[PDB]
DNA sequence: TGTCCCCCGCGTTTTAACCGCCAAGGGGATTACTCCCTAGTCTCCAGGCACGTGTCAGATATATACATCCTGTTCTAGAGCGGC
């Protein structure tokens, strides 16, 4: 329990920085023109944009325990 | 018959083998729609089969000729003996 608690503390302490990192993810428009952005997790909804990172990680852990997340995709998302 | 070197029995230390556990994602298995081509005939005709036959390559034949193998004779090297 203390190990899981400290892991989630490590998640939450930098959460206020990563949340504004993905919220202000300034995608360059030139790569938008000829389609080089990584849209692998954007197709099935594993992206973190427009939403708090900790709550999304909580739902991700819930579905990861549920066994319908295709583990390596959750690995790449993290 | 001998030998010696090639293989077996055993001590030690790694080493990957098997089972313990977890996902992954191509992939075997199943179901369904549909579409091509293969089952089944009609007719025929042109390639395939039975018959007939001139013929041209193979076999028989034999003196001739290969052709290699066996054997006899001679050449040369090696060991033994005798003299200086």
UniProtKB/Swiss-Prot annotation:
What's the name of the protein? Transcriptional regulatory protein SIN3
Q: Which cysteines form disulfides?
A: none
What does this chain do?
Catalytic component of the RPD3 histone deacetylase complexes RPD3C(L) and RPD3C(S) responsible for the deacetylation of lysine residues on the N-terminal part of the core histones (H2A, H2B, H3 and H4). Histone deacetylation gives a tag for epigenetic repression and plays an important role in transcriptional regulation, cell cycle progression and developmental events. SIN3 also has a RPD3 independent function required for normal longevity.
Can you tell which superkingdom this protein's organism belongs to?
Answer: Eukaryota
Question: Where in the full protein does the shown chain start and end, and how long is the full protein?
Answer: 1151 to 1228 of 1536
Subunit notes for this chain?
A: Component of the RPD3C(L) complex composed of at least ASH1, CTI6, DEP1, PHO23, RPD3, RXT2, RXT3, SAP30, SDS3, SIN3, UME1 and UME6. Component of the RPD3C(S) complex composed of at least EAF3, RCO1, RPD3, SIN3, and UME1. Interacts with ESS1 and STB1.
Tell me what else is known: Present with 1660 molecules/cell in log phase SD medium.
Species this chain originates from: Saccharomyces cerevisiae (strain ATCC 204508 / S288c) (Baker's yeast)
Per UniProt, subcellular location reads as: Nucleus
């Amino acid at each position: 329990w203390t190990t899981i608690y400290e892991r989630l503390l490590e998640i939450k302490q930098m959460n206020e920085r990563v949340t504004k990192e993905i919220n202000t993810r300034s995608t360059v428009t030139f790569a938008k023109d000829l389609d080089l952005l990584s849209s692998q997790l954007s197709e099935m909804g594993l992206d973190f944009v427009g939403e708090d990172a900790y709550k999304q990680v909580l739902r991700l852990s819930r579905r990861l325990i549920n066994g319908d997340l295709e583990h390596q995709w959750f690995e790449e998302s993290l």
